[PDB]
Amino acid sequence: GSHMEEEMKRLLALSQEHKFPTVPTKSELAVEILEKGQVRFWMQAEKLSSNAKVSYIFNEKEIFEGPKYKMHIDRNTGIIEMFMEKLQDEDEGTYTFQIQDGKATGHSTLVLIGDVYKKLQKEAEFQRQEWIRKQGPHFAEYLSWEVTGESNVLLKCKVANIKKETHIVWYKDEREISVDEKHDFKDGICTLLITEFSKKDAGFYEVILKDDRGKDKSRLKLVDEAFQDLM
């Protein structure tokens, strides 16, 4: 139609322009289930003078910072950070932050109760990506193989941000490809020679990281012998 309203309704939907739930203050107090998959309350609050009060309310009651609800405000204008690490209350979940600075006052409520949270949890899914249990956003070392002229796969990973001893170490499902470790350095990126591979030796070439923490192995499934056969 001439209105083309819906069409723009899509375009604006594409922009994904958020940041609206404010008040006389500057609340953006919404519910962000973090990457770690936890609960997050966050409004802004540009003014912490005298009266300047924020009221943590849960289930129609005013609560306080402590173990179950942790709050952290660094009064740089009054940014309100607040966390919750799960549900485990009496399954209930509803928080109203009413803030006022000086003479102004604003309300902001969040809800995550069993029936409700499960809803936000889907959205959390995007963040729920807890598979990482370590690397998180942006990895450090990565594999990469290349069948060289001799038809061998030249296994090589690539190192990043790390200062302990060496970087990685090639493996193969508990099988340690035992090469000279720290005697001849092998520092930086490491390259080996899969001089022919076999469908009974193939699988995945493991990269292992042990440093000032525990470990860290991440690898893909390598098959070359199946291709060699085609050569």
UniProtKB/Swiss-Prot annotation:
Top-level lineage group: Eukaryota
Coiled-coil region(s): none
Tissues with expression: Ubiquitously expressed in all striated muscles. Expressed in all fiber types.
Ig-like C2-type domain residues: 137-223
Compartments it resides in: Cytoplasm, Myofibril, Sarcomere, M line
Subunit structure, interactors included: Homodimer. Interacts with TTN/titin and PNKD.
Stated role: May link the intermediate filament cytoskeleton to the M-disk of the myofibrils in striated muscle. May also contact myosin filaments. Also binds beta-integrins.
Annotated protein name in UniProt: Myomesin-1
Organism of origin: Mus musculus
Gene name of this polypeptide: Myom1
